[PDB]
Design a protein around this ligand. Structure first.
Ligand code: QI9
Lengths: 214, 221
């Protein structure tokens, strides 16, 4: 199969801006390239086929160009309804193959994460497990790193993170970081810390608690 | 308006076989090539095969040959795909789509279905455990709701029966040893709770579960 790459998985822009999505093929596909739009809906729509030919019903602010291996999709005046995932396909050789896609995000002013930490409930310990949950809500940009500290030492085992897509209402991101261990292990440590690194702060934002209080 | 409509989510154990459908409308079914695709979170979009409902002429990706059987019923304008001996890799969202070009197709796919989710798992239908997340002592305060060890998806979380929409974050589920887990946060001012009741409502349709965990501050001293 011919392989299709989209090096930029996510692209930042503003409403009214000129946006360019990139696509690459592992060899010459002779302008047999087609572009699609996947909205949050999960719905897919054809936009452009054969490098630059508009599909019926597609707005004119969409256009395409390219040759050989490199191709691109352009949006002259970005609207909120154009915020979606855009991916390409080569139609030169069977089987058809697609790129990983480029998701559009909207630009906004740097916003610091609101960090909140929660000791496990007493109800949860009766199960045998112990989940220490940490929320990091409404921050921008998406770039962020989360570290769990226990009694001073870093910890990686048992940590599962989860991210939301960009919220359209305020153009921010949110993420949950959950540390899960046994009740026996949880009861054998004191200080549990959830510290976040982000552009808005030189020093990491630290949220912690001592088990021996409550 | 050309429109494809695929069938609902499918749960299956490894070793089973399943069959998903795709009903077309707004055009002559017999006159366009239909294609099937597989979207798995690690891979790009992968091509399965294609069938021409006119004479049921078909072509398959060599990797899905013997894995996926394709059929088309002219009577009801419905395409089908059969998947045999399911394994964990068969877990994905499968799309049916129409190929551009009357009779002889083209090099693109001009109309798409919404997709069908196939979940391969041996896990049994399990209700969620729901745990209140209270603070541990600003204008605002954030509370939480931990939803743990349920199967299958989806779960639905609301706050005060939905009367709290603004300031709510519910995160995608994650898989830990065959069961799903997620958390939901809610930010209210510091005015209305310890004083007024805040309650998360977790619903799990598959198990017919409805639980209401009232958020109450931690018991210490
Ligand atoms: C897969 C088999 C069938 C489906 N389309 C109509 C008849 C058969 C051929 C193919 C299309 O003509 C075609 C020809 C040549 N190269 C192609 C490359 C990509 C492609 O994707 C829709 C379709 C191609």
């Amino acid at each position: 199969d011919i392989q299709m790459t989209q090096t930029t998985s996510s692209l930042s822009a503003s409403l009214g801006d000129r946006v360019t999505i990139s696509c690459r093929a592992s060899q010459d596909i002779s302008n047999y390239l087609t572009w699609y739009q996947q909205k949050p809906d999960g719905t897919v729509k054809l936009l452009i086929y054969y490098t630059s030919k508009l599909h019926s019903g597609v707005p004119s602010r969409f256009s395409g160009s390219g040759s050989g291996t490199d191709y691109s999709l352009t949006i002259s005046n970005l609207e909120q309804e154009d915020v979606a995932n855009y991916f390409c396909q080569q139609g030169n050789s069977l089987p058809p193959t697609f790129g990983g896609g480029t998701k559009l995000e909207i630009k906004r002013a740097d916003a610091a994460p609101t960090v909140s930490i929660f000791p496990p409930s007493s109800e949860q310990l009766t199960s045998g497990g112990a989940s220490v949950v940490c929320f990091l809500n409404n921050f921008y940009p998406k770039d962020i790193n989360v570290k769990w500290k226990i009694d001073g030492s870093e910890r990686q085992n048992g940590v599962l993170n989860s991210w939301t897509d960009q919220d359209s209402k305020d153009s921010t991101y949110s993420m949950s970081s959950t540390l899960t261990l046994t009740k026996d292990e949880y009861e054998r440590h004191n200080s549990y810390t959830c510290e976040a690194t982000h552009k808005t702060s030189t020093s990491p934002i630290v949220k912690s608690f001592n088990r021996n209080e409550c | 308006e050309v429109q494809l409509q695929q069938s609902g989510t499918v749960l299956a154990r490894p070793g089973a076989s399943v069959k998903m459908s795709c009903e077309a409308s707004g055009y002559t079914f017999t006159s366009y090539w239909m294609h099937w695709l597989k979207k798995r979170p690690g891979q790009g979009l992968e091509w399965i095969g294609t069938i021409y409902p006119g004479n049921s002429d078909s072509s398959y990706n060599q990797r899905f040959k013997g894995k996926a059987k394709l059929t088309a019923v002219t009577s009801t304008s419905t395409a089908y795909m059969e998947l045999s001996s399911l394994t964990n890799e068969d877990s994905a969202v499968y799309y049916c789509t129409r190929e551009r070009g009357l009779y002889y197709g083209g090099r693109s796919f001009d109309y798409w279905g919404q997709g069908t989710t196939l979940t391969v798992s041996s896990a049994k239908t399990t209700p969620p455990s729901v745990y209140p997340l209270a603070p541990g002592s600003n204008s605002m305060v954030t509370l939480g709701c931990l939803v743990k060890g349920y199967f299958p998806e989806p779960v639905t979380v609301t706050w005060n029966s939905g009367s709290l929409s603004s300031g709510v974050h519910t995160f995608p589920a994650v898989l830990e040893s065959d069961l799903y887990t997620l958390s939901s946060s809610v930010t209210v001012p510091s005015s209305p709770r310890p004083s007024e009741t805040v309650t998360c409502n977790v619903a799990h349709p598959a198990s017919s579960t409805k639980v209401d965990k009232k958020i109450v501050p931690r018991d210490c001293g």
